């Protein structure tokens, strides 16, 4: 009854609010592919990848346009479609690139299905929309701009921000919690990533270190990967390890895990598989007793986090702010569901424009 | 939005088209609670519970009635309706009776969830309708009996029959085997199901002999809750031992299938946690690498397996057919999916007239 | 020669001594049902099951109404009708309240199995009696009351009280145990119960904090079923972690020792299987290595751990002090058991007729 | 003082010798993009890639194109360059199309180097050229095209051949190594591979009634992902259980053997990283004691196994052959590296003019 009967995608490269401070130098802009997935009810669903790399975006987006093919003229069945692309990418490996580009469609199927019934994806899902805590995303700063950042973040209300560490030497690691820490006061959230760049022995002195400071999770200390190595990391500490941004797919999550490789998890819904993905790595989160954050993708984590059994923290990181309407909105912290049919995503046409690439 | 208006039952006693013959004795009917929950759309959702023997059904009925209370006015969201109900039986605990009255509800909700957005239930879960090879499951019949319902079963067409053995001496068990497989044909399906009667030296000495005999599997060969010796059984087959049916919640699934005590599952939709739990038991089986049936509710059962990644068959045994209409239909051998919003359960209200309690 | 000639049940609300302060709000009764067992010798044996939530009050009454039948004519044997019951309730689940009300019948059956030989349960049991010490039994009761209830029970001679905790805030829970502490002195015991409030990660986290105050043990931090969970807890902390009131049947407490998930134990009367369960348990206690403490049913308790080779404490909290005569004693903190009959329950006929439901 | 001066990559569709009969339909060409890496030095390194799928052709292709950038200028050492690109491509994922198209630089640079220093790889590695039995590899044929292939295998002098199953009955899968063994005769291999075809039950059953015909060894019986899965199966055999051609980098071949998810190894020259992963492979193969074989990538593969510890088996299978010289040579069912600087891959551009993509 409802078809899927066509597929465009746009490549953009837009400007970020927040400025990402890497060893490497300063980043502002963000590579995406923006995705419209066609119906025959009228309807068209709506989502965005991320590229990380600008190296990837011009793959990514031509490897949806030659998709295109295997998916039009077949049902709004986002579960069996999944299970079809799954069936035809076994060969050539349904991870990676292929893998991200399932997700983009998963994530649109289910929008234009929230749409075709006009309803918030939340309540497609079989929950009600609640709001959900959030905390503030920044980058490897330095002491005074990270200082700087969470004292803002504090005045709009978030009562947790998250820092990107990993210096040359620990004590610079430790000079950036603690100056936050005093500047923002003592009950506040800090969470510090270390972005995969240590080796066991170092994540486990780094960490115990850390740990004494007061910090909330200690973000993926090592390799992603190398979930023993994680594990033995845990092991050595009391903090909760926060792993999960890299999983693809829940068969990676799942393995994970299964070693316990983490005391928290924070998949990210294009990685994870989109909303199909999604909703499997919450029935495992819940399993193993293990609360579930979400990376990237505020407007549609939002939804997916308020049907998640374990649902931990929202990670506010705008991405597409640039290209999108500001439907989803923070009050006191808290993320709101917009009441709008599928996720909520509108796009700002008239800036799309300026960023094509 | 929408909200829970009210909640009615009416528990009944129902003729069995196919009277289950046991050791004990026959018996001719099943004792049942059936449920309509009230919205504020105007729409009426239905479920039936199973009480399995009459000493139960009077208890379970007066437990909906005076749980009806804390649903009434709250919202039509399934996923959090469960996790209310989760919290508010914590103490006394959340499994038995309890639980099974919780997953009566969440059926009759996402019955109406699918009539409010008009759309069949599999539709409503994200996938297509999709036929489901189905078994034609007798009794412990004896073997002029067992073998005249195979070879009618084999006529309408179904190419697999499940019988329950489990006699006094082992030769009993074979001689029933032995006919069906006589009768049948070679390549016919013979699933077996001792329905907890062994121990477990018994069950790997009996289970050896079915298995060169060419049985499709072993059901619940020992003690439901004893996973550590189904382990111990399934170790020393070829045979896939099946087990599932009395796990109250995807809880005590996660612990049977930790420690591999299976290679197939079948949950019952009613003491899994109706419609969701059996998706977080379907996302379980898919990591787990366990093909999943299904164990009574056919109607329901039908749209699950339809969203199950690993869906395998589906149980045909007619509980509740006297009181409802026969929406869903068999097509050689394979069950199929009425059109029509929700469930497709439409009662007979003349006849459950007859058969209440 | 000995038979069960009939079985009454009362369902009844009473008030309660101390009312149990929740998060939700001010409990001062407890749902109860009231068993007389009667026999072919003339004497009557007497239990009492506790209820939780008055929701599920009505049903269990009905249960055991409806089971009465198959009891009836059976000889007066405990271990002999629980596994008759074990094998009638196989295929609907010997758990929840089954079997609660089947414990309930088997707590009455041996109060009078030792009516008929004119002696007390401990004694029947092979055991001497002895004085148990008690600790008193409090609540979610803010800094205030909690440490006014903690002096009054030093005053009466108790060296050691139970609070439940689990505020929003840890430094809420840290501020009643010192409160507590700073009223009792040093050497007091304080147990602190979370009731299954926090999850894994909050639950190391606040548990480290309690432990450096110096508490008894910790109880039931996470969620009950959460074997696994519990290990985890228990893994990062000297202190001890307890729990058990939840295990329905020693097959639940079987699974969660062979895990390791606890270094203390405390089984539920009812929960547990009632005399028969309680026996089982405490070889397994034996066996594992762990000190097995009550939880509710003092009156019977207070025989059963005298009975038990690795006793540890008794839970004082009177539910049916209000319909019972006051033969168990309290003297300097240890519970007396009367020299009595059976387990020495004496209903007060005319305060039961007040509180019938 | 030697440098990567440049990069091109040519997408073509090129005619299969053997045309691969599939369960979807007949496959006669194959995508892949042939690589050139231009050096200070005057030589010009070369590799090639398989794509799959078409769909996934000019992705690949194009991402490569965008990689360019990073690699010019950069040195020829491979091993480093690995390492470079291992870290920049860290939070997009490093497996993969992205670490296909890192391995294809691996293979070039490999080549190249050998240029430089005008000696065959295989020397380059420390090791001297032997000759490698291979086995001829064909596909899903049917009873009558598989004898017939085999029959021509035996006369070319190959002493084994592969073939796909996995038919809708086993008894099928049965006729096609029945067919094949009596006509090649008791002594040749018969290698079959299920292609990820079947579940773990369905998996165990089957091989075991191969394991009675003879068969050399089994192939990726269910889901590549799924180790455990392959544990079980394997567990159930005495046959050998094959895999490998799927692991994307030597960490994903350690955890499945870490586990023991086979008997027998076969890395993918591409999937495995290129010659630097080849060799770290081969010391994880040694250590687990596995015997290691190829997949695809004929021409470098012959060089690779002559320095492989445990070299086991060489996989013929001539993706490139139309647009390459014939310089590796087949004497007696062996593979002969030919005398040649590099891998001794050389073009036949006439020919690659004509399917350019
Ligand atoms: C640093 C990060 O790992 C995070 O979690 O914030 C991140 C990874 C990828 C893109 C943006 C941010
Ligand atoms: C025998 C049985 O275990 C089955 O699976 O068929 C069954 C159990 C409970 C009620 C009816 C049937
Ligand atoms: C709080 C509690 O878990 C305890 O152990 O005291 C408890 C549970 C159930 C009823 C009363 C008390
Ligand atoms: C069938 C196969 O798995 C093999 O090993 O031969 C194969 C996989 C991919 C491309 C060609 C061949
Ligand atoms: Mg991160
Ligand atoms: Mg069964
Ligand atoms: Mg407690
Ligand atoms: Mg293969």
Redesign the interface.
């Given at each position: 009854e409802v078809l899927i009967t066509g597929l465009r995608t746009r490549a953009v490269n837009v400007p970020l609010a927040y400025p990402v401070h890497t060893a490497v130098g300063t980043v502002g802009t963000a590579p995406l592919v923006l995705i419209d997935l066609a119906t025959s009810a009228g309807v068209v669903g709506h989502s965005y990848l991320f590229?990380?790399?600008?190296?990837?975006?011009?793959?990514?987006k031509?490897?949806l346009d030659?998709?295109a093919?295997?998916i039009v003229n077949e049902?709004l069945?986002?579960?069996?479609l999944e299970?079809m692309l799954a069936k035809?990418?076994?060969?050539?490996?349904y991870?990676?690139?292929?893998?991200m580009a399932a997700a983009g469609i998963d994530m649109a199927a289910?929008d234009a299905?929230g749409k075709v019934?006009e309803?918030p994806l939340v309540?497609?899902?079989?929950?009600?929309a609640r709001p959900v805590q959030a905390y503030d995303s920044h980058s490897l700063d330095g002491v005074k701009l990270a200082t700087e950042r969470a004292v803002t973040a504090a005045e709009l209300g978030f009562r947790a921000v998250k820092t990107k560490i990993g210096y040359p030497a620990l004590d610079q690691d430790l000079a950036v919690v603690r100056s936050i820490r005093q500047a923002v006061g003592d009950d506040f959230g800090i969470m510090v990533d270390y972005?995969?760049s240590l080796d066991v022995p170092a994540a486990i002195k780094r960490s115990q270190a850390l740990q004494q400071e007061g910090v909330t999770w200690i973000e993926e200390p090592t390799?992603?990967?190398?979930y023993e190595g994680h594990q033995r990391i845990q092991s050595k500490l009391?903090v909760?390890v926060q792993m999960g941004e890299?999983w693809?797919g829940?068969?990676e999550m799942?393995?994970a895990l299964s070693i316990?490789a983490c005391?928290?998890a924070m998949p990210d819904a294009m990685?994870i598989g989109g909303?199909?993905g999604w909703?499997?790595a919450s029935?495992?989160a819940?399993?193993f007793?293990?609360?579930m954050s979400s990376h990237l993708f505020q407007e549609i984590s939002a939804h997916l986090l308020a049907?998640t059994?374990?649902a931990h923290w929202l990670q506010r990181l705008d991405l597409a702010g640039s290209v999108i309407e500001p439907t989803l909105t923070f009050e006191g912290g808290n993320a709101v569901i917009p009441d709008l049919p599928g996720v909520g995503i509108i796009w700002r046409e008239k800036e799309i424009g300026k960023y094509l690439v």
């Amino acid at each position: 009854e409802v078809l899927i009967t066509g597929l465009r995608t746009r490549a953009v490269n837009v400007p970020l609010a927040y400025p990402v401070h890497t060893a490497v130098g300063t980043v502002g802009t963000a590579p995406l592919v923006l995705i419209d997935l066609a119906t025959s009810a009228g309807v068209v669903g709506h989502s965005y990848l991320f590229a990380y790399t600008p190296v990837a975006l011009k793959s990514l987006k031509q490897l949806l346009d030659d998709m295109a093919a295997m998916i039009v003229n077949e049902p709004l069945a986002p579960v069996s479609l999944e299970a079809m692309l799954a069936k035809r990418f076994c060969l050539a490996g349904y991870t990676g690139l292929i893998r991200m580009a399932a997700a983009g469609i998963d994530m649109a199927a289910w929008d234009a299905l929230g749409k075709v019934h006009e309803t918030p994806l939340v309540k497609l899902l079989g929950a009600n929309a609640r709001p959900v805590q959030a905390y503030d995303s920044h980058s490897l700063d330095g002491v005074k701009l990270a200082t700087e950042r969470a004292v803002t973040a504090a005045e709009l209300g978030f009562r947790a921000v998250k820092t990107k560490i990993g210096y040359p030497a620990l004590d610079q690691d430790l000079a950036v919690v603690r100056s936050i820490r005093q500047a923002v006061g003592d009950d506040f959230g800090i969470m510090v990533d270390y972005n995969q760049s240590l080796d066991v022995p170092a994540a486990i002195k780094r960490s115990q270190a850390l740990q004494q400071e007061g910090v909330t999770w200690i973000e993926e200390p090592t390799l992603q990967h190398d979930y023993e190595g994680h594990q033995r990391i845990q092991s050595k500490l009391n903090v909760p390890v926060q792993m999960g941004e890299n999983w693809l797919g829940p068969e990676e999550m799942f393995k994970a895990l299964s070693i316990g490789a983490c005391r928290l998890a924070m998949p990210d819904a294009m990685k994870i598989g989109g909303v199909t993905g999604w909703i499997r790595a919450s029935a495992l989160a819940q399993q193993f007793g293990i609360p579930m954050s979400s990376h990237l993708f505020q407007e549609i984590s939002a939804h997916l986090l308020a049907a998640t059994p374990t649902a931990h923290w929202l990670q506010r990181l705008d991405l597409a702010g640039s290209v999108i309407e500001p439907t989803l909105t923070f009050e006191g912290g808290n993320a709101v569901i917009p009441d709008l049919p599928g996720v909520g995503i509108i796009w700002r046409e008239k800036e799309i424009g300026k960023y094509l690439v």
